Amino acid sequence: DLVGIESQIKKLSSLLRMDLKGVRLVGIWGMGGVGKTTAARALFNRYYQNFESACFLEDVKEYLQHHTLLYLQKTLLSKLLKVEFVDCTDTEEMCVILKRRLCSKKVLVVLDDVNHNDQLDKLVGAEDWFGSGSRIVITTRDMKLLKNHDVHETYEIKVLEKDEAIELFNLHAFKRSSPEKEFKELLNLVVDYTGGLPLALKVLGSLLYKEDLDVWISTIDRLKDNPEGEIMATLKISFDGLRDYEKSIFLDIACFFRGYNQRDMTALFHASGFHPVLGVKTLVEKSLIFILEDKIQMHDLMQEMGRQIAVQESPMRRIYRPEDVKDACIGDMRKEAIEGLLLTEPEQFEEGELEYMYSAEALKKTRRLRILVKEYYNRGFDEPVAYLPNSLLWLEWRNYSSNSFPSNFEPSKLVYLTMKGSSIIELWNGAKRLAFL
Amino acid sequence: DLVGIESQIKKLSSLLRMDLKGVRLVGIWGMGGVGKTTAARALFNRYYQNFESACFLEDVKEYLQHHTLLYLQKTLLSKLLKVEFVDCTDTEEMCVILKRRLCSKKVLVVLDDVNHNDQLDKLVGAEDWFGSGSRIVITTRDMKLLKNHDVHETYEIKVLEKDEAIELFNLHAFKRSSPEKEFKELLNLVVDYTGGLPLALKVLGSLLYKEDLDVWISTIDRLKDNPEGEIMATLKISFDGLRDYEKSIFLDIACFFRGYNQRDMTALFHASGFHPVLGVKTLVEKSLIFILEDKIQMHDLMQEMGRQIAVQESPMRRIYRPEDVKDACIGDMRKEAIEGLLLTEPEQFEEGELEYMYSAEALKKTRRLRILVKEYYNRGFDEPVAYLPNSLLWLEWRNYSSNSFPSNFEPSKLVYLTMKGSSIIELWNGAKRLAFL
Amino acid sequence: DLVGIESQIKKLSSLLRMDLKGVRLVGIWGMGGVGKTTAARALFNRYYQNFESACFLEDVKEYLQHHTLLYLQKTLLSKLLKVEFVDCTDTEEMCVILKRRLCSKKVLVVLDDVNHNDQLDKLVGAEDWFGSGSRIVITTRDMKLLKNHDVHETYEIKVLEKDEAIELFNLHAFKRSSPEKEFKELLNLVVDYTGGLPLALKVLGSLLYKEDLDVWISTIDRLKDNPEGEIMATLKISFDGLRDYEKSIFLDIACFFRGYNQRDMTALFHASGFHPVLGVKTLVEKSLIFILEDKIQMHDLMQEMGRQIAVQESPMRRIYRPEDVKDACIGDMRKEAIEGLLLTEPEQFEEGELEYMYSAEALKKTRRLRILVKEYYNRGFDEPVAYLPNSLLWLEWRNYSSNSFPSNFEPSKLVYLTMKGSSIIELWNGAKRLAFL
Amino acid sequence: DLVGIESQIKKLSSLLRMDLKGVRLVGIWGMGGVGKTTAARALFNRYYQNFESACFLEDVKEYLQHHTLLYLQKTLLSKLLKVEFVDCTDTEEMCVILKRRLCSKKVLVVLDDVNHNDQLDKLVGAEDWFGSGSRIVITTRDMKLLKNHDVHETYEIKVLEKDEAIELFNLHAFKRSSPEKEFKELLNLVVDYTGGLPLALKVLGSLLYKEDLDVWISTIDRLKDNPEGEIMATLKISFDGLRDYEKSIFLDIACFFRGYNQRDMTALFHASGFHPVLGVKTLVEKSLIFILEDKIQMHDLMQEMGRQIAVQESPMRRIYRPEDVKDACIGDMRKEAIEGLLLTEPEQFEEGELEYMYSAEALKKTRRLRILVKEYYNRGFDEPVAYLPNSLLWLEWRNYSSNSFPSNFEPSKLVYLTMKGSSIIELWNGAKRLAFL
């Protein structure tokens, strides 16, 4: 029943101001699941009587997946006015027709989802196409398309809060009734799992409906292990579009470095062949990641998205889970595309797979390796390391069994190296290059 | 000519009762091929004159595969009334229009095939959208969508009986004439092969039409070996939708355990990483399996569906057929993804492949193994077993050649173990964990 | 300009007879490229004035690939009559509407391309839907769909003759002008390459248009080596539809046995796991192969279709070309899926690859082998054979270097064995089974 | 604002002449991104008032990807005249209707994008379908379709010049403002990267819009390394269509031989199994390559297209980049499909990978090899060569360490061989065949 929305009509109304002359373009930028269309619909339903004519569209992306762009703009003209479709086999005649016919009128037009600029150029991209008092609202997942246009104001919509999330989930799961004084702990766990994103609340609300308490705990365990693919598909829509390196940057951040320092992240990505100046800016642009106190923290569910995508890959390019380490010991197949590693606690193998993975002869079979992390305290059952291949960019090691680094090691454009081990005599015998740090 | 249908109009009529006031929702839940649309059509054709207006749809799934949901509900309003299409570029205005326009009327509306709840919410999901006396009929393959709605009554439609199946097949194969007193044995074999499911009778009826007796026996042999893919595609439609573990549960049940005990099945699935509380409930929900006397018996054709799907897979994850055992002896490729086994009668190999498969060195190449079944009496040409890898969850062995279990065996969260062998001195030297049984 | 067509209007007219009362169904069955639609159009254009109303469709397959079956039959009613589309969201109401409205009229209706029986049932499948004097023409690639209906007469259309093919090609290549007294030899070679099938003549006619003589010879060489994929796609349309074994039967016939004896072919296919009673009948049914003097001769272009399809396959299951033999000597990859062989002339290897292929140790790496043919006279540089694996079904060997068969050979349900070699003392030492021959 | 276009209206106007009687067909042939539709639109907008009726279409390819050809020509008739759609379920009746109805009128019709001749035949393919004074304009990517028709004149549109490219990019990047006296060097580099092709200017203009100078240099580096896939997709559209050997010819030219001599190129392609008489002619025909001073120079961006396509391939069939050489040293996988090589400067390996690649034992693992180029001066750290496999067609070697060619070398239908080495005693001991040179 539109919970927490009334606080938004004031914010949207304030941006336009409703007393200025001419045309103003406002862009609503979200996250890909947070309330965007519902907010646009609320504004439409409140102010649609002030103008001579108004129109509203949903999911222009799907509309062009079923129809043609010329047809779409054909309907828009026939919606503002009551006239029937006018024949035009050329798009440009239609653009001139919109300019010539509806210039001397005040209208409100809402766009729901756009991804490329020719959409705006063919539909609403102008300044004098509309008369005085007209308002243009464009909803999109990234502000970049808005930036190329002359959008006066923009609004970024954040996730719901604890009280609002609980209220919405309670509304969906129990529309009339109330929990039988035994679901509060489960309520807290479920809502904490999502952390805003009302789409997830809607999906889970319809799932646990007239379901006994016996299935709720199983649902918690499944959600802990499985990403609940239904929401993951809607998030996956935003993933398609990254060209060559943004996927690698996003996968690197999601798999290993979620809340690390920015400067070291840019140093790593620049030294690894990616382009942080472009990749980081556009990833922030598309609301996949956000910067908070010089960190690159993302949403909880987006991390699960990246982890699942990394898992579904025939060559294991990202090993962080313990069982994937076991699968990587086959040999001659998975070594050539390891592209990273993350050693974990050893009380899951019970046969010495962990010691073999970082052994000398195992590391000679891999040739591309950038990230290697070993984070678990030494029990007293470790072995010295020999190879340390000549391709690493990020090094993290716990207690070091060996006396010092091997003499066959070259930094090889290293970036980050911290050693928490308490047994190191000297780092190196001489003074090597250390071009980057 | 709608055989056996007259007994159903009474059952459907009784549920609504036809004398109550307000609106009542009835959900017809079937199996994916049993008569569902035909029953809905019979009810429609019998009671369509009682109401002011009525409408009927087929295969809403396909309709959205060709059109948009907004267009679909646009036609529904234009069907109840004689008015032309009304322009609305937003779905919500259309929902309000249905509520505002057709509230003060009594109508009958039938939905043929739905899969997601937003379909019902956008089309028929309400209580006061329709006037007094309105009836809503929703046909679907699973009652779960009905459960989220306030459906008053539900009806599950079962397969046809022996007499009805024979009558329908005779109608299709010989619409006017009669069998020439030589097809009765073939008639019994063909009808027994299907076992209800009038779709299979329709498919086979049109195939053996003006065909000589010489081809009938060949058809029986082909049907024994081949699953007759045409029907298998319609059943395959229901398979798509299972998220991650329901496919594994269904494949496990179809391949090995069809009529086993429920409790051991849930113990196996819970111990193997799946979620029986969710998977079993939803598989029963989607009418893929049913529970009869604490068993998990399914339909005969669904078993062939699962077996064929398991066969078409580049990594042989399910070996039950004898020739697949031969193909699994290549080595270094099929061992790493064996994920189960089923040894069969040895009078098909004639070269000792069976003894090599369970040999000591063969079992060291496989690391993931949950189910292993060996069911054939010992001729006197067997060999002792050595490895018995440390990953099994289900064990079944015939006469045991070895004296006792190897000392290198750990139960490894075992679940089921029965030994029909008559040569066992002691199970183990000591007392191990045996956490699960 | 419709060459050779006038001889067909008489044949089609004679079948209906044009003086009978009631409704008659005639089915035109072709080959998949021979003139079918053009013949139907000629009959339509000649007799469309005799009836009150008439209609004609093209490529119902494509129409349902873009529209819905309900829409298709909606247009058919609106074509016979001048009335606008009538609303009906259920197909069955539309079928009853056709029966109720157009029963008392005489019409001519032509169907262009159908593949499944529900098309005919929903559109034209009845006897009293049409009034006296109505004619139904159904064009299809296989008579099986006609057989399930009560088609009175059928006509099979064959390829064009030498004179007609030359005339049509000359019309396409030189619509006004004439060859400059130097293209006659090239004309004969090109027309001989196609051998009828006016679609191929149309494709090649538009390709060699205002092209110099220098490119013509290159075109002949390319056509000799390349199958000219454009026509191959139209033929490929018919390939899709074979379920599991018809593809294997067709590939076996195209690759090796084109003009062999029928009885041995059925013996091979029955002994190899296929079903000749079904496969051969339906392949003849779909006009892929035809029987002439107890042979299985096919069209020339269909053989190139099968050969190309066999070539495009990552596992080399059909080796007949000489360079594929070289590619099959890699080892451990191609042996496990050889599924046949055809040794050819040895003056293309010049390094002894041919002798290695049939060597003893090479044949132990293959386990599935049915067809093996060795047809080239012994120069005096051959070696004795040792293994002769225990899976063959068809054997053909030239001059035999060895004295007799190896003692480790079992017939293994052999079917065909002829030996043209002049050096054989005895076939076997004893008397083995020889279950099939 | 249509920069540089005014010089084109005169050229197009001159071809028709605008004073002749009858109908004339003019074909505009471009490159796949150069201004073609905009030029056609300019001519339309200037001369559309002279005729009774006129029509214009865009992207007929997409129109048939969403609609049917019959529907397309249905709209064309309803555009010239004001009448509503006329029912016709057969295309041929529609063609006769166009001939019968609009013959006695003068019209202007523009086709935007065609790929197959039946499009023209069904729409505009005739001479007397239109009255005196009618003009037909057909825009297409290749003149071959025009050649089959009776097109009187053709116009090929070239890329923009330096001044025009700078003006257009400045218009897109700064529509109102001007560069802040610091972007001139960046302007020159960006425009030089594209070299005409206004589509690339449009794409890059919208990307660097209100972007700081810090991101511009990163964009230059990314464009140097990445092909900017957005434009590459539009160019990729033209790639689809080449049948079997044109792709191989194009990949060979793009990867290695861009500005080489024509005659040696045709000799190589003819000797390698391709058909230069067909392949070269049609590649020039489709405006992928052009001939300049007996060279095969292409556009700069098309070379990046070919290089990227060659890179995205699981079997490395084209090794020219230095890191791909490292990836090709795995062994037993990449050797069997090397199909060419290009050795580069050795100050990128620093471990001796280059010497191993051309070593004796490495070359025995490859069996298909046509092109091998080694272009870097000998530092004094090279090794003699032994194998030189018996399959090469093109040889290029720098300073030769060995005394002479190995005695196990056969020319093997060699084509090109130049040796810049200064240490060669004799080419061969005797006189071998040397069939081709």
Ligand SMILES: Nc1ncnc2c1ncn2[C@@H]1O[C@H](COP(=O)(O)OP(=O)(O)OP(=O)(O)O)[C@@H](O)[C@H]1O
């Ligand atoms: N604050 C809220 N109150 C009530 N319902 C909400 C709220 N936020 C979201 N929803 C519901 O959850 C769903 C979320 O989709 P939403 O309307 O946000 O589209 P969207 O996220 O803009 O679409 P996309 O991001 O894919 O373009 C909607 O169906 C909406 O009904």
Ligand SMILES: Nc1ncnc2c1ncn2[C@@H]1O[C@H](COP(=O)(O)OP(=O)(O)OP(=O)(O)O)[C@@H](O)[C@H]1O
């Ligand atoms: N009892 C019956 N009498 C006569 N015909 C039947 C009977 N049952 C099924 N059929 C025929 O067999 C076919 C089975 O399809 P049915 O009408 O059951 O659709 P459905 O199974 O509801 O579709 P789905 O399950 O894919 O949603 C129908 O075409 C119907 O004509």
Ligand SMILES: Nc1ncnc2c1ncn2[C@@H]1O[C@H](COP(=O)(O)OP(=O)(O)OP(=O)(O)O)[C@@H](O)[C@H]1O
């Ligand atoms: N005898 C002929 N005279 C003139 N033209 C012909 C002749 N036979 C075929 N053609 C031309 O060659 C083409 C062959 O296609 P045809 O009309 O035979 O369709 P079809 O083969 O029935 O289609 P399909 O087999 O794919 O269903 C047609 O476009 C037709 O114009």
Ligand SMILES: Nc1ncnc2c1ncn2[C@@H]1O[C@H](COP(=O)(O)OP(=O)(O)OP(=O)(O)O)[C@@H](O)[C@H]1O
């Ligand atoms: N000289 C020019 N002046 C202004 N704008 C141009 C010029 N040339 C191209 N453009 C713009 O760049 C884009 C290039 O596309 P264009 O109009 O050339 O279509 P096209 O290349 O004919 O399409 P295709 O080649 O894919 O069939 C157009 O949108 C056009 O607006």
Ligand SMILES: [Mg+2]
């Ligand atoms: Mg939205």
Ligand SMILES: [Mg+2]
């Ligand atoms: Mg149904």
Ligand SMILES: [Mg+2]
């Ligand atoms: Mg046809």
Ligand SMILES: [Mg+2]
């Ligand atoms: Mg264009």
